[PDB]
Amino acid sequence: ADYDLKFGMNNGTSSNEYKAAEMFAKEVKEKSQGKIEISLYPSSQLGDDRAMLKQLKDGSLDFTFAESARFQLFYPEAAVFALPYVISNYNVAQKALFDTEFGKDLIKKMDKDLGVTLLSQAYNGTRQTTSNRAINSIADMKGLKLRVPNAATNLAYAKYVGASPTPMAFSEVYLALQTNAVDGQENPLAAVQAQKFYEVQKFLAMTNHILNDQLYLVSNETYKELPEDLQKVVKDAAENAAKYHTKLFVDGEKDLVTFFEKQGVKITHPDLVPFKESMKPYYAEFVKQTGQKGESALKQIEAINPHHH
């Protein structure tokens, strides 16, 4: 094609993210009259999300996904998006990004410093905790060998609840669970399904601890080369795909608990009051480390009412 573009992702071919990326690719190909073809590179073929963000910056990959929170790697205050229990729901996540001074500035910096254009934002589920033994209360976390991604906020979730974290890439998790090298992991329900973690985890606990969004990002080096009518095709397709993406996750959350039960998984509902209490010293450490910018980001986010209006 005139533009042989590539979209890298960590998720696999059975995931909601992949299905939404397929919708995006199809719409772009059709509405560009075949000028643009987007090929998909799932399952961390190209590296993890940190690697893929570098590749968008240098123009060697055209599209990828990232969470708003992942930008903590560059702007420490952006950890606010994944401080456990701070962002209440997706309504808050949307407003935090697009309707705060903090979030608007972040989007501008992503364009200036990191070489990426934000096309759209979707919901990517609320993270829960799976394990090889029951989590009936916070006490069961103590010393649980909890896999986390290579992200400071997830590492802190594990530490402050009393678990023993083991960071590793997403691709490595199924093996680690299967062999009981670790005792559990934490991810939204849809990823537990997509990766078939239910095959290698007998328990799931509704810890509700981190809210994930999902940004459709394009390399500036690619986006600048597209004539403006094709930029519009891409932007509009990303917005349409993100609405579909969100819907896939909202519907999965409704029924996935009963899917897992049918697969033999035992679901627990630990009391979250001590989980939330356990994060208070972590918030204090975030404020100490990130200073006025972090205090401000917190304040701006805590001011957002979570009810749709």
Ligand X SMILES: CC(=O)N[C@H]1[C@H]([C@H](O)[C@H](O)CO)O[C@](O)(C(=O)O)C[C@@H]1O
* Residues near ligand X (CB under 6 A): 10-11, 49, 65-67, 69-70, 149, 151, 170, 187, 191, 214
Least distance (Å) from ligand X to the CB of residue 10?
Answer: 4
Return d(Cα 212, Cα 189) in angstroms, integer. 12
Q: Name the nearest CA neighbour of 210 among 72, 309, 47, 48.
A: 72
User: Residue 106, Cβ neighbours under 10 Å: how many?
Assistant: 22
Nearer to ligand X, 151 or 298 (CB): 151
User: What's the closest the beta carbon of residue 41 comes to ligand X, in angstroms?
Assistant: 12
Q: What does DSSP assign to residue 187?
A: E
By DSSP bridging, strand 266-268 and strand 203-205 are parallel
Please report how close the Cβ of residue 91 comes to ligand X at its closest, in angstroms: 20
DSSP 36-100: EEEEEE-TTTT--HHHHHHHHHHTS--EEEE-GGGGGGTSGGGGGGGSTTTS-SHHHHHHHHHSS
Residue 16 assigned to a binding site: no
Helices vs. strands in the chain: H and E counts, helices first: 11, 10
CA 87/CA 96 separation, integer angstroms: 9
147 is in an annotated binding site: yes
Q: How far is CA 271 from CA 52, 63, 303, in A?
A: 38, 40, 26
183 labelled binding-site residue? no
The residue among 52 and 138 lying less far from ligand X, judged by its C-beta, is: 52
Residue 50 is assigned to a ligand binding site: no
C-beta of 211 vs 226, nearer to ligand X: 211
Q: Which is nearer to ligand X, 169 or 287 (CB)?
A: 169
- Identify whether the C-beta of residue 121 lies closer than 8 Å to the C-beta of residue 239: no
Least distance CB 159 / ligand X (angstroms): 16
Residue whose CB is less far from ligand X, 182 or 230: 182
Residue 67, annotated ligand binder? yes
CB 39 within 8 Å of CB 21: no
Which is closer to ligand X, CB of 62 or CB of 67? 67
- Confirm whether residue 127 is marked as ligand binding: yes
Task: Quote the least distance from Cβ 215 to ligand X, whole Å.
Answer: 8
Residue whose CB is less far from ligand X, 18 or 275: 18
CA dist., res. 102 & res. 147, Å (int)? 31
Instruction: Specify whether the CB–CB gap between 268 and 135 falls below 8 A.
Output: yes
C-alpha to C-alpha distance for 81 and 72, rounded to whole angstroms: 9
Annotated binding-site members:
10, 49, 67, 127, 147, 187
Annotated binding-site members for N-acetyl-beta-neuraminate:
10, 49, 67, 127, 147, 187
